[PDB]
Amino acid sequence: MQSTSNHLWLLSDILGQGATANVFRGRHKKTGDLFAIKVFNNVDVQMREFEVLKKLNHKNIVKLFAIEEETTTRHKVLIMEFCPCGSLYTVLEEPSNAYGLPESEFLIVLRDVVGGMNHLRENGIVHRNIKPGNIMRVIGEDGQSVYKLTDFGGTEEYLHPDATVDLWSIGVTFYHAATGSLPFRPFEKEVMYKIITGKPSGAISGVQKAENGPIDWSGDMPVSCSLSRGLQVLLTPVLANILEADQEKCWGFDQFFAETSDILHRMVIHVFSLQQMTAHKIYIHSYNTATIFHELVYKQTKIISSNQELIYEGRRLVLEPGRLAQHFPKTTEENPIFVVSREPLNTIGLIYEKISLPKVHPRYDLDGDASMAKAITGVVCYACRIASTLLLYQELMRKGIRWLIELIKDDYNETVHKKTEVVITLDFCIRNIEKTVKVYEKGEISDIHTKLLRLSSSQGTIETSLQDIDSRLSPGGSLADAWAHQEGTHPKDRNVEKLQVLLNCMTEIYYQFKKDKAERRLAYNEEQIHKFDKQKLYYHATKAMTHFTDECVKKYEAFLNKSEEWIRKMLHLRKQLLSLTNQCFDIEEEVSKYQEYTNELQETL
Amino acid sequence: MQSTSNHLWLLSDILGQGATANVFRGRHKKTGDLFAIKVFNNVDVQMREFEVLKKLNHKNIVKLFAIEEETTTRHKVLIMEFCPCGSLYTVLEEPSNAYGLPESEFLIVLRDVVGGMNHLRENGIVHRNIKPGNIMRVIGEDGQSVYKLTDFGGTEEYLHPDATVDLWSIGVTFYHAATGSLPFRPFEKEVMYKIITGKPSGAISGVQKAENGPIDWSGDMPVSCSLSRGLQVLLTPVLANILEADQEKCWGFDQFFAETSDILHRMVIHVFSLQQMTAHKIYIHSYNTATIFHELVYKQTKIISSNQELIYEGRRLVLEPGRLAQHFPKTTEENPIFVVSREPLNTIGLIYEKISLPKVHPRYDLDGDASMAKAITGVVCYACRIASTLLLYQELMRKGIRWLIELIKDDYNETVHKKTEVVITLDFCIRNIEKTVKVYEKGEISDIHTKLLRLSSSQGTIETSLQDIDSRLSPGGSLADAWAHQEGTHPKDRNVEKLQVLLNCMTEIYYQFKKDKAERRLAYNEEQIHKFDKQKLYYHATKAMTHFTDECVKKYEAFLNKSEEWIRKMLHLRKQLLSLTNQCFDIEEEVSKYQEYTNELQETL
C-alpha cells in the first residue's frame, strides 16, 4: 500500500488507469471516510489551477478537498470525493439502456449537465469539451440520481471534426443518451469529415450502411427512441441547432441555456386519446391557461379545440379558459385525462420498432462473446419494455370504455325525463283546449288541433327510438363491454414477469462473460462451462422472443381490432342520441308558445 | 475436488455441513447443469428408502435424480436438484422479515407446505415433523416463489415438549413465519414443559419476561403482525386448535387440510372505510352473493347492512343481492371500494406498534455486533413499512373526499330541479283556480287558497335553505377540500425513499459485520474500520428514526385531526339535504291531489 500524511490506500483498489495519473479508492486516516485519490507520476501553474478549483462549491461539481504529498516518493495527490456509481459510460453500458435512457433519467441528466455548465461559466473557469466520461453519478439523499462534473480544465467520436464554449460534444452526449447510439456513424478520421461536411441543414444523424455509399440523413429521433413525442418536439430543434456543421450558425451558450431552461421548467400532463388508443405527455408551463392546453392537445391528437371532451375519474371535466395549469388535477401514467371526440379518427395503437435477434457466431472468440451477450440482452430488454407498454394501453382502454358507457347513459337519462316533462305539458294543453272548445260551443281551432296531433305523433316516434337506444345500451346488448374482459392480456397472466425471469438469467450470463473477458484465457473446465453458457444464453433469448411475439403482440392486435369496431358503434349511437335530444328541444320550444296561447284563450272566455 | 461416474464438485463449494453428510454444489459432467450432491461418510434399508423417494414427482417435493458412488472412496452420494435461494431460515433472517413475512408470501408458504404434506400423506410415506430447515425455496417460472419439501424420512424449539401426523412443528413454523418470533419463550428443557403444560385453552403464545415469574398468555397475533385483520380472524382458530397442549383435542390432518383449503380458496376484496380511515381485506369465496359481502363488511367496520353506501371509481355501486362475488369489479390496494355511512362512527386511523432503537453496547464483541446490527436494521425496516402505509392512507383519504363531494352535489342538483318542477305545477294550480273563481263569481275556495298560500310560503323557505347549502358546497366555502392538499405528506416529498437510502447503508454495514463474524479475528486496520462502521450504523439509525417520528408521524396526526372535523361537517350537511328532499316530496304528494281537484272544478264549470 501507500500513504500520505492523512490518507492511505491499498494498490488493489484501482478505480482508474491513465497515462497521466492513477485513481485509487482510499480512506481518511482518522475518521475512516472514503475518498478517491488521484496520484500523479512525474510546476505552480497547475498548483494555482487546483487552488482555483478548490474554492468551488456547487451540487454539480465534484469537490476537491485537499492536495497533498506521498510519503515514500515525493509525488502529488488529489483527494476528491468518492462517487461509487461510476460515470455515464457505466450508465450507458447497461443492457436496459441500450436504446436510450428513460425520459425521467434523461431530464435529470440534462438539468444537471446544464447547471454545471452554467456555474462553471458564470465564475470564469475555462474548461474542456465535456464528454460522457466527465460526468460522474451519485445517489442523492432522496433516491434520485445527481450528476456531477469532473476533470474539467472511444473519447474521439465526441469531438468536432476539424474562450467561446463549443457545444458539439454536449450535443453528441445528449443524442447518445437519448437513443443509445452515436449520431454520425461511418461504416466499420477523414470519413468523419466527409460525412459531417456534406450534411444538410436540420439533420441530426446520418447513417452509412455500405462501403463509400451515400449517407442516409435523418431529421428525427429514431422509432426505438423511448422519449415521448411531446419531448421530442421540444428537443429536436435544440440538437438541430447545436449539431450544425458551420460554427457561425450555432447558438453559443446563452441562447442554449434559455431554450433548455424553457424545456426544463415545464410540468407534464398525461392525456390518453381514446379513439386513437395513444398516450401523450403534454408539456405546459405552470402559469398557462386552459386555452394553451387545448392547443397543445390539438397539436398531437389532431382534435379541434371545440371537440375535445375531457374525462377524469368518472365525471366530465370542464376547464374554464381562465384556469391556470397548476390548478389542473394531478395525473400519472395510470391516471390520465381521457380525450373523446364526436367526429371520427384513425385508431393507430402503439408504434414500435421490430427488433430481431442477431445471429450467434459459433467460434470460440472470447472478445466477441461479450459483445454478442450485450446485444442479445439489449434486444430482450427492449422487448420487455414494449410488453409493459402494450399492457398499459390495454388497461387504460378497458377503463376508458367502462367510463364512456356511463356518460352515455347519463345523457340518455336526462333526455328521457326532459321528454317526459314535455309530454305532460303537451297532453295537458291538448286536453285543456279541446275540453274548452267542446264545452263552449254548446277559427284557429283546427290550426291548433292538427298541429298538436302532429306533435303527439312525433312524441310517439321519439319514444320508440329511445326504447331502441336503451335496448342497445342494456347490459347484454350490442354496446356492452363484455368482450373487453376476454381479449388482450390481463395483469393476472403475468407476461412481463415471465419475460423478466428470462431477462435476469441472460443478464447473469452476460456479467459472467464480461468478467471472463478481462482474464485473457481460461482453464479446460472453465472453457467448457463458457461454451455451455454461450449456447444457453441463445436458448433463453429464443424462448423469450417467441413468448413475446406469440403471447403479447398477437393478443394485442386482436384487442385493437375489436376496439376499432366498438368505437365505430359508439360514435353511431352517440350521434343518434344527440339528434333525439335536439328534436325534443324543438317540440318544447313549440309547446311553450302554444301553451301560452291556450292559457290566453282559457282566460278570455 | 472429487468425482463420480457422471458428476464432479470442488470442495470449496460447501452448501451444508452436518454430522451425517456434506452437501456440495456440483455439476453434471456432460451437460454442465448444476446439482446438489449429498455425500455420506460411513445397508439396503436406506437404499430402498431412496428408491421409494425416487419415484415421487410433485411441484412441492425436491427431486432425487439418482444415487451413485464416489470414485476414490466407496461412499454413497445423492444427486438432487439445486435450490439456489436457500431454505426458509434464510428467508426469515432477512431484516425486512424481522416482524413477519408479507401477507402474499405468507399465503404462498401456507399453500405449498400444505400441498407437500398432502401429497406425501396420500401416497403413504411416513415422514418427520417438518421445520423451517426442511422447506427449500426456488424462483418459479413467473417470478413467484415456490416452496419445496426436502429431508423427510436451533432445531429443538419446534418440537412437542414431551403413523399419526403431529402438527406442533407446522404450527410453530407458521407462527414464526407470521410474526417473526417463536410463540412460547422462556426468559434467557424443563421450563418449556412447565410453560406449555399450564397453558390455557385458546392461547397461542406465552411470554415470560422475568426469572420464574408468571407467564403472559395471549390469544391474538401481536400488534406488529403484518397480516391483515380479515386473515387473522381466519387464521387464529387454526393455530389455536393445532397448538393445543393435549394431543387428544388436536385436529389431525383431515380437518386441518379442510380448514386451510377453506382459507386458501378465498378471493380478496379491498375496502377502505372512509369515516374510520381504515383499510380492510374482505376474504370471500368466488360463489358467494352480495348478502355475504355486506355481512363481512359489517363484521369489520361495524356498519349495519342497510347503511353501507359503496363508491367505486366516481359513481356509486349498487350490488343487487343475487350478484356473485366473481362478478364484482376488480380492486387493488390503491383502488378500493369506499364505504360511507350516514350515522356517525369513530375515526381510528392506523394502529401500529411503537418500536424504539436498542441500546448499542460499547465493547468490541465480534459476535454481539452482528446481533445488534440485525436488530437495529429490523427496527428501521419496520419504520419504513409503517411510513409507506401512512402515505397510502393519506392518498386514499384525499381521493375519497374528492369523490364524496361530487356525489353530494349530484344529490343537490336532482333535488333542485325536482323542486323547480313542483314549483311550476304549484304556481300553475294557484293561478288557474284563482282566475277561475275570480271570473266565475261575476265553498271550499278558501280551504284551497289558504293551503296553497301555505305551500308557497313553505317553498320560499325551501329555496333559501337550498341557497345556504350551495353556499356551503361552493369551492371556497366551508366544505371544500382545499385543506387536504396542504397537510400530511405527499408523494412528491419522497419520505419513503429517504428512509430507503439510510436503510440500504445500514444493510450494507450489517452484511459486512455478518461476513466479519465468520472470520474469528481481524487485523489492526480491519478492526479499526469495524469500530468506525459500528458507530456509523447507529448514526444512520438515529437519523432515520428522527426523520420518521418528526416528518411522517406528526404530519399524519395533523391530517387525521383535520379529517375528523371535515367528516363531522359532511354528516351534518348530508342530513339536512335529506330533510329538504323529503319535504319537497311531501309538497309534491299534496300538489298532485289538489291539482286533480282543481282540474275537476275547471271541467265541471
Partner: peptide, 9 residues
Amino acid sequence: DLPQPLRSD
C-alpha cells in the same frame, strides 16, 4: 467450437 464433456484430471 462445440462443448465437450467435463473432466477431473
